[PDB]
Amino acid sequence: MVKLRLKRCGRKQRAVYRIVAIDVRSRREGRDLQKVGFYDPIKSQTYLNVPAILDFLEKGAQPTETVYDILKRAEVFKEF
Amino acid sequence: ADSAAKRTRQAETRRLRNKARKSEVKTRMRKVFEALDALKKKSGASTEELVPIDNLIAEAYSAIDKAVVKGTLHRNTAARRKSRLARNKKVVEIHHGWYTPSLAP
Amino acid sequence: MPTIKQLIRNTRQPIRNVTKSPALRGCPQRRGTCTRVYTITPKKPNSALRKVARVRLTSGFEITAYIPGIGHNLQEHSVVLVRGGRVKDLPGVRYHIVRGTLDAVGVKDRQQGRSKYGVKKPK
């Protein structure tokens, strides 16, 4: 399926990452149905948009490694 | 040999599956060929109709045998087996459609 | 030209900005091969001996190009680098030759505006 994954969105030596739920066959910087999330590893926030991640994980788009690790920081996981 | 082949390994397996699928699709063409052949004969000159259907049904069962068996292995999608079993029973329904079984919607 | 039908057929179109250099036809300046290094005169109001090199180009044309500056090294069959720009006085000369580039030396002893003539700094 769809695989919720980051994409690099920034300058050189910056690493401002989006969390996009695109199809896994696409290149890493493509297009999404809905670009759900944010991750700034230098130091800043991470907007998550919980209902849409629950929509796609409720559908069954498995995430990658560190997207899943961000999803294990917060308490997003509910099986409903 | 070389430490990495990776594609000649494919082409080896492609040669093998070419042999198997070529062969057994040809079996399917032979058995459908015999069914339509005997149906052509009993359309031509039979003169007793509701009796000898046991042979046509027997070979047609062998046709549905190898048809659906090659539907199991991946060489025929659904709606290939559907179209060709429906083809054989279109032909059977036409040979009875000329004659003594009366069928009307 | 009404808005109806003499003009939703077409008005007309202007052609282009017509090319002011028919050679150089890719882009701005192009390597040349000297064929003649003769000298011609301008039209009637002026009076000079302007020294032009008729030059074959790498494009596929042959064209008579002007040689700027005072001194010139250009003999038969040397290599130059022509550029665009119309010398008015000479009928037919459409192009210039860059000085200081390949096999066409800079002008002798010039100390005002050297980048147009390919002369490095003195002093």
């Binding site: - | - | 808005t3 109806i4 003009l7 939703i8």
Partner: protein, 78 residues
Amino acid sequence: MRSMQGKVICATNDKTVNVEVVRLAPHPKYKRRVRKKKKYQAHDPDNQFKVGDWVQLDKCRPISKTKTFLAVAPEGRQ
């Protein structure tokens, strides 16, 4: 979407009618309303359309190369 109502041109083909469809369109650079006609092949198993009647085209499964519509009847609210 909409249907495409329009006159029947010539029905000398079984189950098949050519239909002129007249469509107003704003011309792009100059701001009028130019009509463009475009004629289609529609399907009818009933083939109950003479020359000159006017039908409504609705998209269906393609029947031939050109025959990709079947036309039934307009509403007729005058």
